[PDB]
Each structure stands twice: as C-alpha cells, then as structure tokens.
Amino acid sequence: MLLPKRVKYRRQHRPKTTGRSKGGNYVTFGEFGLQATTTSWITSRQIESARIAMTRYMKRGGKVWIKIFPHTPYTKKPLEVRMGAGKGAVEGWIAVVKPGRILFEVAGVSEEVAREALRLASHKLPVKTKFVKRE
Amino acid sequence: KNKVRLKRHARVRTNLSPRLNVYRSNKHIYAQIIDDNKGVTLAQASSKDKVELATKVGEAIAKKAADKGIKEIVFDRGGYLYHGRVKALAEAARESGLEF
Amino acid sequence: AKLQITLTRSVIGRPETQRKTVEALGLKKTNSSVVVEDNPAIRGQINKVKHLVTVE
Amino acid sequence: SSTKNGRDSESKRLGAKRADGQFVTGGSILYRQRGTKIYPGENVGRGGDDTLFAKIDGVVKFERKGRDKKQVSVYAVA
C-alpha cells in the first residue's frame, strides 16, 4: 500500500513511542488538517483506509496530502514457535505518530465537507485527533 | 607560482624546524636565518644590497651570522628546488663557514 | 562555625554516593547534628543530600 | 530458522589514557586510536599503530589545531 522502495536494513529497533512530536506540527500544504492527540503506530494498511474514506467522501473533488509516511519495518515470527532462534520476518511498515503531528491535510473544500471527511478518516486510525485550520 | 610555491613550502616545513630560509624572485634572492619558536630573525641578506649574486648573498648571510655568533643551522629550501641558484646559495654558506 | 546540620532522614535505600556525602559531612546517625563553618564547598555537600538533612 | 550472526571481536581498550593537566613519564601512552582523531603535538610521538605517546617527562595538554583538528602536547613541569 505504502512502503519505501529500498531499505538498507530489513530489520530495525523499534522507534520511541514516548515523548512529544518534533516536526510537522503546523498546516503547510493546505487549508485544513487532522491533528493527532495520542501516540501510536499507524500501519500503511490503515493509512490507506483513511485516505480512501476521505477521498470518496469529497467526491474526489478536493486535494489531500498524507503528511506521514511509513519508513520502519516491524517484524513478526510465525504461528507457534518458541522464543529465540533469531529475529523474525517483516510483517509490515509503520509510522510512529506522537501528539501534535498533522496526519492528513486537505484543501479545495469548505470547512464542513472537509470536517466530515476528516472525521470519517479519524475512525480508521488508532489515535485520537482533532480538526485544525491553518493559522 | 607563489600560491603553489607556498604550498610546497608548507609541505616541506612539516618535519623541518634555526631556519636558514630563502625566497627567490625574477631577479633577487632573499635569504634570512630565522628562529622558529619566537618568530625572531637572527641575520639578514638580500640580492639588492644569476649565480654570482647567489654566492654573494650566501657569503653575506654567512659573515653576518659569523658576526652574530651562531653556527649550526637547518636549511629550508622553501619549496624551491635545490639546484643552481639555491644550490649555490647552499654551497656558499658551507664555503663561508657554517654547518649544513 | 555556622550551619548546624541535622540528619533527619535515614540512608537506608538511598544511593551510595549519597551515603558517602552524608558520612563526609560527619553525620553519624539519624537526628545527629554537626556544626560546620560555612564554606562555599561545605554548602555544595548539603545540596547533594538536601532531602535528608535540616540546616539552620 | 537459525541465524548467521552473533560473532563479534574482542574490544580493544581505546582512547585517552591520561588527563589534561597530569604529569606523565618519558614513554607513557597518552591516547590510543585508529587513524588520527588527535594529532601529535610537541614532544609527542605518533608511533606505529597510531598510538600517541610522550617523549619527555612533563604535563600533558590537549590543544586544538585551528578548526576540526586537535593535538596533544607535553610540557616541562616548572
């Protein structure tokens, strides 16, 4: 769905989930956006579901920017095995979202269609959010 | 050339250094024996005071150092080649009495 | 000899460097109290262990 | 699913071995390094293997060489 095309290292230590957000805290590409208010890992598979909801709601009329990209490949081990004997295989790709980052941005839409689209997006992402407008 | 003569001199002067340092020109030669832990000069010699004059300047620097009471030296070719003019400048101070 | 300093908290369950500071002040037991002439360097020892003492 | 990792090398005790302001002897090792993270100052020998050592007995001092490079010199005490 989304993933980097090359990675130097298939297997990585997992990112810090504790703390606040360092960058991407202000609307840049558009008028409105969805700000995060809770930390988690958002997978590519659900980034895409939120994008589909937002896109179909606006009739594919307005513009959308997915401000976050999954760079970090998390692993998993198979069904029923014991601990150890090496690290597992890449399950998927995740982004780490902390309080304050702007998950999606939209423009080309009034406040109400954008508000309902962003609301209908926030139900498919494991974090709490709120509606944000450019300063 | 001096922008690169200086580079070969800075290459020379990483192992070496009192100095007996030199400087050629289109017509002149500026010899001088210099300390290297205070920035102080000890003697002096120029060309306006091409190998006859090289011997002249060598003799001058050597007899000035003889008046100044210093014998053992280290010779910096200053990034020029040790040949002809600077060759004679080295072979005048040995022949005037000095240590190379 | 200003700075009457009294040891008012125990050192059981305190880090070890802290145990070292308080002993270097001369505080033997709890409620013990040493008088020490105010230095600029004796004061820096009653900040490493500010929580466990009482100064006056 | 065994793995083809795990092996490492013996760590080689590396870095500063004296202190800025300390008296050192005539052949004491001042610093250990790969390459030249610190260049030899005065009365410091840059021996083979890239280790920096003293020559005279004196006090050691980490200075810098302008920007982005620093050296180690040794002085006479008093």
């Binding site: 805290n25 202000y26 700000q35 208010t37 309080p99 304050g100 944000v132 300063e135 | - | - | -």
Partner: protein, 93 residues
C-alpha cells in the same frame, strides 16, 4: 496598537513560567536599537485583539521603559495542543 507590558525581574523558574501560562499571560522578549532586552509579560488575550486589529506585520506601542517604542513581532512560539501562544519576539526599530 497600544499595549502595556510590565517587566518580569529575577530568574524565571519553571514554576513561575507555568504560573504565567496557566493564568493568561504570555512571556515576551524585546530588543533592537535602544531597547536593551527587557524581558516582559503581555496579556494573552490583549495581544490577540491588538495584533488581529493592527494586522500581522503591524506596529505596536508597548510598555518599554514605561514608554512607547513601536515594536514588531519577529517570531512567536505556539503550543498548539492548547492553541496558546507561548513566547513572542518584539523587534524594535
């Protein structure tokens, strides 16, 4: 426009700033020709309703030396999770 700002004096401890921010005051800093860096406080609403009046790149008379100096707003920090401005930079002229 017209703004009155009183100096904050001393070392602003952590609790001191957290008291000025859970009250309705915004810490500020001033500088430029003749100002000489008076660390000040401003109303967290009054500044809004003065700069929303005189516009973004306007001109403002402040409590600088208990007099007006026609200050600017170079930058400003903004805690967005409460939508509250956290620090202002007044560039005098």
């Amino acid at each position: 426009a017209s703004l009155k700002s009183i100096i904050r004096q001393g070392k602003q401890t952590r609790s001191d700033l957290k008291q000025l921010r859970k009250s309705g005051k915004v810490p500020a800093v001033v500088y430029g020709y003749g100002t000489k860096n008076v660390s000040v406080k401003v109303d967290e609403v009054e500044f809004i309703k003065v700069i929303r009046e005189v516009g973004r790149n306007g001109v403002i008379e402040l409590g600088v030396g208990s007099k007006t100096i026609k200050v600017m707003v170079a930058d400003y920090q903004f805690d967005p999770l409460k939508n509250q401005i956290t620090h202002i930079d007044f560039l005098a002229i």
